[PDB]
């Protein structure tokens, strides 16, 4: 049982949208809300497009991002903002955190994405086998409604 | 992907290759070999095959791996120790490094390999969308005869 947040956006030559499912247990355990103290387990789905002009053909996971999420309850103005880590699950590799909720409501929440090149991702540049410049740091920002998953 | 090195081993539920080529250009060249001061790129090729446990599909690029190489010139029995960087080129991501040979003859390189979880990546454990636990550390190696390019 998986949930749209929002519909899915394509920038930078890459398809970025965002999901929620109840919540995980991740290993390393510990490491943020166990399922139990979660309402939700938050992802950020971003692959390649055609036309990339990073190296990546079209359907290919983007690695090495780092992601920060901007998560307001739009009925409260409630607040709340953390990182994803990768990980990966048994249809692949995303982006994710668990997340207690708001309560029910309108929410908004926007991903702010850096590129591979900020997480030790190297290019290269030589005109035989190099890759264009990394994209600039760029925000997207989804709106949806949270009822709870039961 | 220019000059094969030895042959892939599939291990792991992985097709792992070494391969070099010509020194490359890399941004913005920071701990590492300028392409002028070395003698090639050589790098670890790494996609899951069909039945990976870890949560990879066929042919898929294996991310956040930690790979340190041990390179012997086998004829004079020189050694070399150094690390691979994750990089991006034309033909996709893959783990490599400019290395300085160490003259032309039989050459055996090891490739150290750590599993995603080392360099920050988290596995889903529950039952609907969980994967299997991490291979251990492990080695690979290629036996190859390096003759310039
Ligand atoms: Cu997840
Ligand atoms: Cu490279």
């Not at 990546?56 to 991002?65: M, N, Q, R, S, V």
């Not at 999420?69 to 668990?98: C, I, R």
């Not at 090149?117 to 086998?129: F, L, N, V």
Request: aromatic share 10%; no cysteine.
């Amino acid at each position: 049982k998986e949930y749209p947040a929002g519909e899915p956006v394509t920038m930078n030559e890459m398809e970025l949208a965002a999901v929620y499912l109840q919540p995980i247990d991740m290993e390393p355990r510990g490491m943020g809300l166990p399922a139990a103290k979660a309402d939700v387990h938050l992802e950020a789905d971003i692959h390649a497009v055609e036309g990339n002009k990073n190296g990546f053909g079209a359907g290919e996971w983007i690695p090495y991002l780092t992601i920060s999420y901007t998560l307001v309850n739009n009925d409260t103005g409630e607040k709340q903002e953390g990182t994803f880590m990768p990980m990966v699950a048994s249809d692949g590799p995303h982006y994710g955190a668990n997340i207690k909720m708001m309560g029910v409501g309108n929410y908004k929440v926007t991903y702010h994405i850096e590129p591979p090149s900020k997480a030790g991702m190297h290019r290269h540049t030589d005109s035989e086998t190099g890759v264009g410049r990394w994209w600039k740091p760029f925000d997207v920002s989804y709106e949806f409604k949270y009822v709870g998953l039961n």
